[model samples]
Target: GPYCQKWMQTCDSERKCCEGMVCRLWCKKKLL
Candidate 1:
C-alpha cells in the first residue's frame, strides 16, 4: 500500500505474543 514491501517476517504472524512490541522497541518507531 505505502511502498512495495512485505510484512515483517521477524514478527509472529500466527500469534499475538509479539515480543518486539516492547516499549523500548516501539518507542524507537514513535509508537506507544
Candidate 2:
C-alpha cells in the first residue's frame, strides 16, 4: 500500500523504488 501514491516519497527518497517496489509512474494514479 505504501508503494502507492507515496511514490512521491519514492522520488523524494530516490528513483530506486523501482528496485524492489515499483514506486514509479504507477504511483501517479489519476484518482483518490
Candidate 3:
C-alpha cells in the first residue's frame, strides 16, 4: 500500500470522503 488514494488511511475499505468528510468514522485528513 503506497498511495492509498493520495493519503488519509484510517477507515476500512469503500472510502467515501466527499460528503463533508466522513469515512465511516476516522478519516484523519484535517486541513481546513
Candidate 4:
C-alpha cells in the first residue's frame, strides 16, 4: 500500500496533472 501511494505521488509530481490540451493528450497516450 505504501509503495503504491509513493508511486502515485511520484507520477503526480512528474506529470503535475497536466492542463487543458496537455491533459487531453496525456489521456490519449494512456489509452494507447
List the candidates ranked by lDDT, beginning with the highest: 3, 2, 4, 1
Winning candidate number (lDDT): 3
Better of 1 and 3 by lDDT: 3
Quote model 3's TM-score: 0.20
The sequence of per-residue lDDT tens digits that candidate 1 reaches over residues 1-32 is 33211233232344332333423312113344
Better of 1 and 2 by TM-score: 2
lDDT of 2: 0.45
TM-score of 2: 0.16
How does each model score on TM-score? 0.15, 0.16, 0.20, 0.16
**Model 4 spans with C-alpha error above 4 angstroms:** 9-32
Candidate 2 residues 1-32, lDDT tens each? 45634545444445544334444544344433
Flag regions of model 1 displaced more than 4 Å.
1-11, 18-32
TM-score of 1: 0.15
- Judge candidate 2 at residue 1 and give its lDDT: 44
- Per-residue CA lDDT of model 4 for 1-32, tens digit only, reads 33333233333335554221234324212332
The digit string of per-residue lDDT tens for model 3 on 4-28 reads: 4346545656665443354645454
